[PDB]
Amino acid sequence: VHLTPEEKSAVTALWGKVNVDEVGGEALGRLLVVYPWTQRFFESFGDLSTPDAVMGNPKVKAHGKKVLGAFSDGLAHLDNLKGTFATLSELHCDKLHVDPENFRLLGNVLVCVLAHHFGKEFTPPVQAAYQKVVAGVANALAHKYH
């Protein structure tokens, strides 16, 4: 993606503040509740029947941390989102059969969790810089679909 000096620093700053461990479990948790259809990729996860069940779910928790862990590593290679994610891109397509649209969903849910976690610190311009990253990560993961 392309980000202005100002946008790169917005992104990085805010992210060093993030505890991935718990922002991931929230992002995934919220994905599963707001877009329940995404629940299809997680039948082995136990009970996802209630927001409460989904937020308290430990596999969700475990998984969210993982996802975001990866997401994190991407922030570090913002310059070449594609190269970074190809292996996961390939995995996502070939073995997981995860519709790339689910990447866009999570990305939007991540932004909401950010705004929610940081309140007013997460300003419009910050939001925008973060919207280009999410979009770029989603394209980075959709990149190897065939």
């Binding site: 877009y35 059969h97 519709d99 790339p100 649209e101």
Partner: protein
């Protein structure tokens, strides 16, 4: 919302479809699988080689349903009731994919019915596909 002109235009075009509904439904899905490769993620358990009995069976099922939808255009919700639950509770296909399938059906129809596919019928079909997709999607959450 489908105007009465709309339904007239849908009932007419689909009529022409007639007996090819099945085959046009397979071609549509082959069209989607080809242009929008991501739709495949939902049929990893299908042999998606062109002509597969699976894609042929599936397209047939899809068409029936459209015809069911044409036949009951003044009460789609109720008619696709069962399909709606299936989509929302089991298959859980992302709602954007419907739009891609709509487009492929529209191209299948465009290519099969040179005569009927006027600006108007085109407008009406699209609205129709839009409505069908809305209904199959309405019980998502």
């Amino acid at each position: 919302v489908l105007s009465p002109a709309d339904k007239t235009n849908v009932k007419a075009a689909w009529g022409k479809v007639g007996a090819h509904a099945g085959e046009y439904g397979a071609e549509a899905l082959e069209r989607m699988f080809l242009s929008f490769p991501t739709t495949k993620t939902y049929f990893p358990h299908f042999d998606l080689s062109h002509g597969s009995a699976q894609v042929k069976g599936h397209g047939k099922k899809v068409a029936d349903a459209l015809t069911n939808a044409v036949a009951h255009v003044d009460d789609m919700p109720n008619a696709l009731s069962a399909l709606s639950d299936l989509h929302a509770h089991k298959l859980r296909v992302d709602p954007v994919n419907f739009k891609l399938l709509s487009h492929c059906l529209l191209v299948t129809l465009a290519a099969h019915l040179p005569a009927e596919f006027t600006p108007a019928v085109h407008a009406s079909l699209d609205k129709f596909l839009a409505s069908v997709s809305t209904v199959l999607t309405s019980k998502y959450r």
